[PDB]
Amino acid sequence: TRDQNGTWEMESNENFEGWMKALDIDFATRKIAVRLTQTLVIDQDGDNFKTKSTSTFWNYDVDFTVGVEFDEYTKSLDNRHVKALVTWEGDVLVCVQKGEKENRGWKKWIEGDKLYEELTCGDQVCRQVFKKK
Ligand SMILES: *C/C=C(\C)c1ccc(-c2ccc(OC)cc2)s1
């Protein structure tokens, strides 16, 4: 299934700090952020997505249309400019953010009843699992 709508509550997080470090996020922010449970809210209608990632320490939203490149400022995460593109590979939603960092982006897929995601930057992969609230 390609339908990723829902309020997704984190069950598992792995190597979130490695991903943040590859983005050069500073020590103090990483030390706090690595402790935190996350939520991911996805509003999906056709190609049109609204995605929110939140914890007690951040609340980041991004809107996009599958298949349409968008020039993006990454805002409070790392204040960088990238050319972002989200597409489907089978039932995997793949985002590539072209810019200074290599291998940068994320992937999301439904597996069983859960939402799995990968967060990538450089040689680092963060793996996460969420349950649908
Ligand atoms: C589809 C998944 C997305 C858009 C994200 C997963 C983690 C995100 C994130 C954004 C910003 C911060 O710090 C401000 C932390 C995590 S976004």
Curated annotation (Swiss-Prot):
<feature type="binding site">
    <location>
        <position position="108"/>
    </location>
    <ligand>
        <name>all-trans-retinol</name>
    </ligand>
</feature>
<dbReference type="InterPro" id="IPR031259">
    <property type="entry name" value="ILBP"/>
</dbReference>
<dbReference type="Pfam" id="PF00061">
    <property type="entry name" value="Lipocalin"/>
</dbReference>
<keyword id="KW-0813">Transport</keyword>
<dbReference type="InterPro" id="IPR000463">
    <property type="entry name" value="Fatty_acid-bd"/>
</dbReference>
<dbReference type="GO" id="GO:0016918">
    <property type="term" value="F:retinal binding"/>
</dbReference>
<dbReference type="GO" id="GO:0006776">
    <property type="term" value="P:vitamin A metabolic process"/>
</dbReference>
<protein>
    <recommendedName>
        <fullName>Retinol-binding protein 2</fullName>
    </recommendedName>
</protein>
<dbReference type="GO" id="GO:0005829">
    <property type="term" value="C:cytosol"/>
</dbReference>
<dbReference type="GO" id="GO:0015908">
    <property type="term" value="P:fatty acid transport"/>
</dbReference>
<dbReference type="GO" id="GO:0140104">
    <property type="term" value="F:molecular carrier activity"/>
</dbReference>
<dbReference type="GO" id="GO:0008544">
    <property type="term" value="P:epidermis development"/>
</dbReference>
<dbReference type="GO" id="GO:0005501">
    <property type="term" value="F:retinoid binding"/>
</dbReference>
<dbReference type="GO" id="GO:0019841">
    <property type="term" value="F:retinol binding"/>
</dbReference>
<keyword id="KW-0683">Retinol-binding</keyword>
<comment type="similarity">
    <text>Belongs to the calycin superfamily. Fatty-acid binding protein (FABP) family.</text>
</comment>
<dbReference type="GO" id="GO:0005634">
    <property type="term" value="C:nucleus"/>
</dbReference>
<feature type="binding site">
    <location>
        <position position="40"/>
    </location>
    <ligand>
        <name>all-trans-retinol</name>
    </ligand>
</feature>
<comment type="function">
    <text>Intracellular transport of retinol.</text>
</comment>
<keyword id="KW-0845">Vitamin A</keyword>
<keyword id="KW-0963">Cytoplasm</keyword>
<dbReference type="InterPro" id="IPR000566">
    <property type="entry name" value="Lipocln_cytosolic_FA-bd_dom"/>
</dbReference>
<dbReference type="GO" id="GO:0005504">
    <property type="term" value="F:fatty acid binding"/>
</dbReference>
<dbReference type="InterPro" id="IPR012674">
    <property type="entry name" value="Calycin"/>
</dbReference>
